[PDB]
Amino acid sequence: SGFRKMAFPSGKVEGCMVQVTCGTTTLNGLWLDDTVYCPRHVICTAEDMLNPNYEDLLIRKSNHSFLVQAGNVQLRVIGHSMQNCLLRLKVDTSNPKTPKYKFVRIQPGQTFSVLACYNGSPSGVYQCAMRPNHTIKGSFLNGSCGSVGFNIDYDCVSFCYMHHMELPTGVHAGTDLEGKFYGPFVDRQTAQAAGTDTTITLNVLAWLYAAVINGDRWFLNRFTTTLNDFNLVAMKYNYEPLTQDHVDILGPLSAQTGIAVLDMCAALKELLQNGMNGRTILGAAALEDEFTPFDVVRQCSGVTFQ
Amino acid sequence: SGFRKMAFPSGKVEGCMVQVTCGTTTLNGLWLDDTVYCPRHVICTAEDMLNPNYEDLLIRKSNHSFLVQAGNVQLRVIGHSMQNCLLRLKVDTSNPKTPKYKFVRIQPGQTFSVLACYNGSPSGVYQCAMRPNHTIKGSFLNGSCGSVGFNIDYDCVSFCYMHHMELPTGVHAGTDLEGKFYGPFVDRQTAQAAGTDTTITLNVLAWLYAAVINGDRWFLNRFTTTLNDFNLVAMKYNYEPLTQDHVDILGPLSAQTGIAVLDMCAALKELLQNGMNGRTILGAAALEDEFTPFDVVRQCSGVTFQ
């Protein structure tokens, strides 16, 4: 029983974190096999950031311009390329701790674990979601650049995020592990701001199913609804429209609770229209949208509470 | 910026988890040096649990009664004792991955990371608090017994919890690493239930300070209050009384925000009396009590947002 924001065990990833220094800037890198991946802005000075030309800045550097430390040991750099907004440093040593891994570009609404690091030392781990506006609502301080996000499937680490920057609203922006940004953001100092966000409807519904599997059905009602009718309500409350695809996804959860997806949607619209009346769901006072349907099945009993 | 329920990196602990089987029951154990620690109810049958005599049940077993697996490797048991509600199995191999560690008995209101495990394989990590009623609000399914709770200080793992059981309300109960239960609970099947709980006032206040450090002060007011006056309000709302000790603890946070502790208390009572008026704090719709003051300084900037 119970339900919590659960992160994946971070061990396989801790073994990959290193420190990367170039001139006066130090940040975190990811050491897999004989390559270290980090944000390219490690080669910038404060004023560089105002309008960097990374191609121009990088040609001016050599292999010995970079200092990579793994714990107490310095790794020798013997090559370097820029891949999009990332640097790849070839090093003279293969990481003995390299887990089986892939690089995946995550979709909005999906969740992942973040291992926050400073100076190449893991400091904490937490779960978060890729917002519709392509930001994540993280917890990062200075020096966290290079921290990564990942999921774990069997023994395989799927790396999906590397942290680059914080936006004026205190939310965070970064790239996948090929250095392509999530969202319309760039790695330089500008007036860029998060676009307006929206609530992840599929996740909220998943979470309501979670509440039921865990023996709670107070918010339910006798009504059902049309996709179209639900979506008129969604618009008004800044929720993403529900699509037939999302209804299909909620299949398995619908079956194990015996609650038709569109009936759940009827409950959801009632909650949005009537508020929660000072009550809680899964201990929360407002609707939660950072659990996917996958997260729910991961963590919940395969047997519902009644 | 940002603020999240942050768990400690779980790597040092993952390296210690094993599987312990006795007869038909399998659960998790903790392998440090040449000892494996697990819940003693691993030696019970379903009906045994109704009224076990652990002394009587254990004398009937031998070293070869236990099967310990670490990944694919079976560890040979060569001794066994009961320490309170725990079993200690001496094994023929010292765990090469044993971190520097201590066993500490945590106090109510304090927080820790939980590594949820099944069949000796870590499945997820999350943060939680020891409730005043000595339970934790965890997320555990069948087979999670033996999962542990810990904090990390420098390189030293402080183990503070081992999971034994779930209570009728779906909250969880377990022991410290000497096998002494937190709370008035016992490891057998009975009508035991969680006592009534209360909100952790010191943590709520810490969290309000966190909101300020992060640039939010909407809930503040021009008033101050007496310890006594605050506590009359606390009683009515099922919050723990505030004590001079708690005011001292909130010192450092009070200094860096420039907000007198008792002024913060005035804000708190206003919030409790007036509700949040459909607004949020740190993104939450109700007051949060699972962050200690220590957690706040850990994760927040040492420089407040303005």
Swiss-Prot record, chains A, B:
Topological domain (Cytoplasmic) residues are 1-306
Active site residues according to the UniProt entry: H41 (for 3cl-pro activity), C145 (for 3cl-pro activity)
Q: Which reaction does it catalyse?
A: TSAVLQ-|-SGFRK-NH2 and SGVTFQ-|-GKFKK the two peptides corresponding to the two self-cleavage sites of the SARS 3C-like proteinase are the two most reactive peptide substrates. The enzyme exhibits a strong preference for substrates containing Gln at P1 position and Leu at P2 position
Peptidase C30 domain span? 1-306
Record's subcellular location: Host cytoplasm; Host Golgi apparatus
Task performed by this protein: Cleaves the C-terminus of replicase polyprotein at 11 sites. Recognizes substrates containing the core sequence [ILMVF]-Q-|-[SGACN]. Also able to bind an ADP-ribose-1''-phosphate (ADRP). May cleave host ATP6V1G1 thereby modifying host vacuoles intracellular pH.
The record's subunit annotation is: Exists as monomer and homodimer. Only the homodimer shows catalytic activity.
What's the protein name? 3C-like proteinase nsp5
- Native species of this protein? Severe acute respiratory syndrome coronavirus (SARS-CoV)
- Supply the source organism's classification: Viruses, Riboviria, Orthornavirae, Pisuviricota, Pisoniviricetes
